Design an enzyme around this catalytic site. Sequence first.
Site, PDB file in Angstrom:
ATOM      1  N   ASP A 197      -3.480  -4.223  -5.876  1.00 25.86           N
ATOM      2  CA  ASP A 197      -2.858  -2.918  -5.986  1.00 25.86           C
ATOM      3  C   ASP A 197      -1.359  -2.954  -6.338  1.00 25.86           C
ATOM      4  OD1 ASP A 197      -5.339  -1.948  -5.089  1.00 25.86           O
ATOM      5  OD2 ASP A 197      -4.651  -1.623  -3.085  1.00 25.86           O
ATOM      6  N   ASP A 229       0.788  -1.228   0.000  1.00 21.79           N
ATOM      7  CA  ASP A 229       0.000   0.000   0.000  1.00 21.79           C
ATOM      8  C   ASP A 229       0.822   1.280   0.000  1.00 21.79           C
ATOM      9  OD1 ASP A 229      -2.697   0.855  -0.220  1.00 21.79           O
ATOM     10  OD2 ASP A 229      -2.700   1.600   1.803  1.00 21.79           O
ATOM     11  N   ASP A 271     -11.719   0.317   5.110  1.00 18.64           N
ATOM     12  CA  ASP A 271     -10.649   0.617   4.179  1.00 18.64           C
ATOM     13  C   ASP A 271      -9.470   1.330   4.817  1.00 18.64           C
ATOM     14  OD1 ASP A 271     -12.059  -0.335   1.795  1.00 18.64           O
ATOM     15  OD2 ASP A 271     -13.343   1.387   1.988  1.00 18.64           O
TER      16      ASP A 271
HETATM   17  O1  LIG Z   1      -7.638  -3.242  -1.144  1.00 17.26           O
HETATM   18  C1  LIG Z   1      -6.536  -3.485  -0.305  1.00 17.26           C
HETATM   19  C2  LIG Z   1      -6.606  -2.728   1.011  1.00 17.26           C
HETATM   20  C3  LIG Z   1      -6.202  -1.248   0.844  1.00 17.26           C
HETATM   21  N1  LIG Z   1      -7.253  -0.394   0.300  1.00 17.26           N
HETATM   22  C4  LIG Z   1      -8.631  -0.862   0.488  1.00 17.26           C
HETATM   23  C5  LIG Z   1      -8.804  -1.690   1.754  1.00 17.26           C
HETATM   24  O2  LIG Z   1     -10.167  -2.042   2.002  1.00 17.26           O
HETATM   25  C6  LIG Z   1      -7.963  -2.939   1.725  1.00 17.26           C
HETATM   26  O3  LIG Z   1      -7.759  -3.274   3.108  1.00 17.26           O
HETATM   27  C7  LIG Z   1      -7.578  -4.662   3.304  1.00 17.26           C
HETATM   28  O4  LIG Z   1      -8.848  -5.285   3.325  1.00 17.26           O
HETATM   29  C8  LIG Z   1      -8.805  -6.693   3.469  1.00 17.26           C
HETATM   30  C9  LIG Z   1     -10.215  -7.243   3.178  1.00 17.26           C
HETATM   31  O5  LIG Z   1     -11.192  -6.562   3.954  1.00 17.26           O
HETATM   32  C10 LIG Z   1      -8.187  -7.050   4.853  1.00 17.26           C
HETATM   33  O6  LIG Z   1      -7.961  -8.440   5.006  1.00 17.26           O
HETATM   34  C11 LIG Z   1      -6.829  -6.358   5.027  1.00 17.26           C
HETATM   35  O7  LIG Z   1      -6.344  -6.518   6.348  1.00 17.26           O
HETATM   36  C12 LIG Z   1      -6.849  -4.868   4.627  1.00 17.26           C
HETATM   37  O8  LIG Z   1      -5.551  -4.266   4.619  1.00 17.26           O
HETATM   38  O1  LIG Z   2      -2.742   6.654  -6.154  1.00 18.42           O
HETATM   39  C1  LIG Z   2      -3.650   5.610  -5.839  1.00 18.42           C
HETATM   40  C2  LIG Z   2      -5.044   5.946  -6.400  1.00 18.42           C
HETATM   41  C3  LIG Z   2      -5.007   6.319  -7.879  1.00 18.42           C
HETATM   42  N1  LIG Z   2      -6.365   6.527  -8.386  1.00 18.42           N
HETATM   43  C4  LIG Z   2      -7.292   5.415  -8.183  1.00 18.42           C
HETATM   44  C5  LIG Z   2      -7.322   4.931  -6.728  1.00 18.42           C
HETATM   45  O2  LIG Z   2      -8.055   3.702  -6.659  1.00 18.42           O
HETATM   46  C6  LIG Z   2      -5.922   4.720  -6.169  1.00 18.42           C
HETATM   47  O3  LIG Z   2      -6.002   4.498  -4.754  1.00 18.42           O
HETATM   48  C7  LIG Z   2      -5.984   3.134  -4.347  1.00 18.42           C
HETATM   49  O4  LIG Z   2      -7.278   2.546  -4.481  1.00 18.42           O
HETATM   50  C8  LIG Z   2      -7.287   1.156  -4.164  1.00 18.42           C
HETATM   51  C9  LIG Z   2      -8.696   0.601  -4.440  1.00 18.42           C
HETATM   52  O5  LIG Z   2      -8.939   0.724  -5.825  1.00 18.42           O
HETATM   53  C10 LIG Z   2      -6.880   0.955  -2.717  1.00 18.42           C
HETATM   54  O6  LIG Z   2      -6.822  -0.427  -2.415  1.00 18.42           O
HETATM   55  C11 LIG Z   2      -5.523   1.624  -2.433  1.00 18.42           C
HETATM   56  O7  LIG Z   2      -5.239   1.567  -1.041  1.00 18.42           O
HETATM   57  C12 LIG Z   2      -5.545   3.078  -2.894  1.00 18.42           C
HETATM   58  O8  LIG Z   2      -4.317   3.759  -2.657  1.00 18.42           O
END
Ligand SMILES: OC[C@H]1CNC[C@@H](O)[C@@H]1O[C@@H]1O[C@H](CO)[C@@H](O)[C@H](O)[C@H]1O
Ligand SMILES: OC[C@H]1CNC[C@@H](O)[C@@H]1O[C@@H]1O[C@H](CO)[C@@H](O)[C@H](O)[C@H]1O
Length: 293
Positions: free
Chosen positions: A119, A81, A266
Site C-alpha cells: 500500500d 496505512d 483487516d
Molecule cells: O494489507 C495491509 C493491511 C491493511 N489493510 C488490509 C489488512 O488485512 C492488512 O493488515 C495486516 O495484515 C497482515 C497479514 O495478515 C498482518 O501481519 C498485519 O499485522 C496487518 O496490519
Molecule cells: O483510499 C484507499 C482505497 C482506494 N481504493 C481502493 C482501496 O483498495 C483502497 O483502500 C486500501 O485497500 C488496501 C487493500 O487493497 C488496504 O490494505 C488499505 O488498508 C486500504 O486503505
Amino acid sequence: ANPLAGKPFYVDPASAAMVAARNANPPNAELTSVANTPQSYWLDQAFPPATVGGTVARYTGAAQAAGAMPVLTLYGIPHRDCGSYASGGFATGTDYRGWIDAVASGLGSSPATIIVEPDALAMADCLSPDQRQERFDLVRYAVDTLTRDPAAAVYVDAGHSRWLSAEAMAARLNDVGVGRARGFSLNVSNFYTTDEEIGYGEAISGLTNGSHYVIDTSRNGAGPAPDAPLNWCNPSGRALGAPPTTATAGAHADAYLWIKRPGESDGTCGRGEPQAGRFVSQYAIDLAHNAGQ
Ligand SMILES: OC[C@H]1CNC[C@@H](O)[C@@H]1O[C@@H]1O[C@H](CO)[C@@H](O)[C@H](O)[C@H]1O
Ligand SMILES: OC[C@H]1CNC[C@@H](O)[C@@H]1O[C@@H]1O[C@H](CO)[C@@H](O)[C@H](O)[C@H]1O
C-alpha cells in the site's frame, strides 16, 4: 530467469493458522488446508532495528533447512496505512532506514522473496508532497539496500487494478528504482480476480522495462465484493484463490503467492471486528468453505 521457480515456498510452522489448526478438537479440514499453505511472514515496527536482523536470519535459515523459499513482507513504513485500521510503522525515515539496514544484514546472501511495503506507493497521496517524496525515497532505499542480497527477489508493492492507473503506478515504481528490483506485487490483501490483475500487471510491466510481478491470490477465488467503500475491509462471501505457484497465466507473472494471511482480520472495519492482523478462525473457515473446502 524466474527466481521463484525451483523450490517450494516455505510453510511457516508458527503461523496463527498453524496454531489454530493444531488446537482444533476435532481437527478441522478448513483450518488445516489454510495452515498447510505457504504464506508470507510479515515484519513491522514490533521488530526493532536492533534485533530484526536475527529474526530475519532465523526465518530464512529455517526456510533453507526446509529446502524452501521464504516470503517476507515488510510493513513498517512511516505513517503506515495513513493512520487508518492498520496504523503503525516506524516513527521516522531515519528509523526506517536503520530497520532496512538490519533486515539486509539478516538476509546476507540467503534466498528470500521480499514484498516491500503493501500500500505504501498506492496510498501515498494521503501525505503532503514533502512527506510523499520522503516515502518514495524510503521505498527506493529499501530496493537499493535489500538487493545487495543477490538471492533476494524483491517486489515493490504496486496496489491493484482498481487503485492507481497503470501509468500512475509505473511512474512511482520508476521513481523508486523498480529496475533494480525483480519487480512489483499486486492485489495484496485484496480480492480482485487473477485475470484482472494479470492484465494490469502486464500493462505496468510494459511501462517499467519488462519488470516481473507476483499476485496475491490468498482471498480472490470468488473475485471482489460489490464496489463500495470498505469492500476490502473483512468482506463476506470471499474465497481462497489459487494456491501459491509459479505456474501462472501471465507472461511476466513470476508467481501467485498468499501474501495476506487468510483468517487474519483487516481491521475493526466500522463493525467492532478484531484489530488488523489478529487471526480469526471463523474467517479462515469461511474463506475455505467458500472455495468448496
Ligand atoms: O494489507 C495491509 C493491511 C491493511 N489493510 C488490509 C489488512 O488485512 C492488512 O493488515 C495486516 O495484515 C497482515 C497479514 O495478515 C498482518 O501481519 C498485519 O499485522 C496487518 O496490519
Ligand atoms: O483510499 C484507499 C482505497 C482506494 N481504493 C481502493 C482501496 O483498495 C483502497 O483502500 C486500501 O485497500 C488496501 C487493500 O487493497 C488496504 O490494505 C488499505 O488498508 C486500504 O486503505
